Amino acid sequence: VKWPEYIRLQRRRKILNLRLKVPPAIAQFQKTLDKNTATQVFKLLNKYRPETAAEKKQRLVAEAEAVANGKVSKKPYNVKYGLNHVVALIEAKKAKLVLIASDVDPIELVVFLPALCKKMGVPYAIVKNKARLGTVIHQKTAAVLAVTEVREEDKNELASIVSAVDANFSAKYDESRRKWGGGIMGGKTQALLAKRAKAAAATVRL
């Protein structure tokens, strides 16, 4: 078998990130929110999607016609997105729930967010894929989402989601996110490495 170079790079990077010792700030992203709660998170998030580019123009031209003939509204409620915008919201202590993508490509973009969210007192969760967050906000990718205000109808729903994240993500893991990650080896890998280690330690010290 002869894999292409880019396919070989992909799979080696997968194994390499496992064998190495991942620091606690980077290993906490290996432990994401469970599948049930993530579904409930995105149910609430999909009631606050920002309006589409067509739907916004549809609304604006509707109001433009009214003034063109002859002529006050409510504050829009939606989900907050954008790394700089969300980080500014967390430092402002305005965010109620921060949802960090688990595979942001340069990981240091989000590596401080769990600590910043815990410093400011914001309930946060790490959810799977940057594309699920992107889907909510009509983008291809969202490194992080945040909820600051919801309608009075969904105040009780958000209070249930926040408790579930607290019970299933923060109360859980917790100590597991303070431990260096990695070093995971296959079923037969330690035995092979033990033979290699004892052979090397015998006389192969140069």
Partner 1 sequence: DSDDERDRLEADLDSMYSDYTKRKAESDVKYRVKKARNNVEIVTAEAMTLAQDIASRRKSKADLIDEGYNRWSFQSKEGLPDWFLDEETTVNKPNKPITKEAVLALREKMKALNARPIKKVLEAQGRKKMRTIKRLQRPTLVVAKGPNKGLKSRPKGVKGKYKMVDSRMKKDLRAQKRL
Partner 2 sequence: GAYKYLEELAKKKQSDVNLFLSRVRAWEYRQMNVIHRASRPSRPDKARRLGYKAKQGYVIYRIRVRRGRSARCTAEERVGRYCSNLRVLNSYWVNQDATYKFFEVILVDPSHKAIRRDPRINWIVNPVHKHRESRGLTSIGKKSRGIGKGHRFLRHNTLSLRRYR
Partner RNA sequence: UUGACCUCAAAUCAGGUAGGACUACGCGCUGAACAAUAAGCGCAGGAAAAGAAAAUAACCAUGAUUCCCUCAGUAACGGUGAAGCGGGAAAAGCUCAAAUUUGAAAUCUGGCAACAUUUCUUUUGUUGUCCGAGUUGUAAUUUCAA
Partner RNA sequence: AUUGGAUAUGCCAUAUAAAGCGCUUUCGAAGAGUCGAGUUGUGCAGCUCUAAAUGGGUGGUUCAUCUAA
Partner RNA sequence: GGACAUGGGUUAGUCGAUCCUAAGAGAUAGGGAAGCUCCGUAUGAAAGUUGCACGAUUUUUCGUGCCUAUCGAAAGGG
Partner RNA sequence: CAGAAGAAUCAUCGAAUCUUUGAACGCACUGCGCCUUUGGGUUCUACCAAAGGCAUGCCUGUUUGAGUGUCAUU
Does 4 help bind partner 2 (rule: CB under 8 A)? no
Does 9 help bind partner 1 (rule: CB under 8 A)? no
Q: Which does 146 bind (CB under 5 to 8 A by kind): partner 1, partner 2, RNA, none?
A: none
The residue (of 60 and 197) whose beta carbon lies closer to partner 1 is 197
Long-range CB contacts (within 8 A, 24+) of 70-75: none
What would the x/- binding string for partner 1 be over residues 144 to 163, using CB under 8 A? --------------------
Six-digit token string for 101: 């993508």
The residue (of 61 and 194) whose beta carbon lies closer to RNA is 61
Report, in Å, the least distance between residue 169 CB and partner 2. Answer: 21
The 10 Å CB-count burial string (b at 16+, else e) for 59-86 is: eeeeeeeeeeeeeeeeeeebbbbbeeeb
Does 109 help bind partner 2 (rule: CB under 8 A)? yes
Q: Where are the alpha helices (DSSP H) in 111-178?
A: 113-120, 130-136, 155-165
Which of the stretches 111-119, 134-142, 153-161, 168-176 binds RNA when contact is defined by CB under 7 A? 134-142
Neighbours of 45 (CB within 10 A): 22
Q: Diameter of the chain by CA atoms?
A: 93
Between the CA of residue 166 and those of 44, 57, 195, what are the distances in Å?
Answer: 16, 39, 45
Residues contacting RNA: total by CB under 7 A? 61
Q: Which does 116 bind (CB under 5 to 8 A by kind): partner 1, partner 2, RNA, none?
A: partner 2
Does 157 help bind RNA (rule: CB under 7 A)? no
> What is the footprint of partner 2 within residues 34-93 (CB under 8 A)?
83-84, 87-88
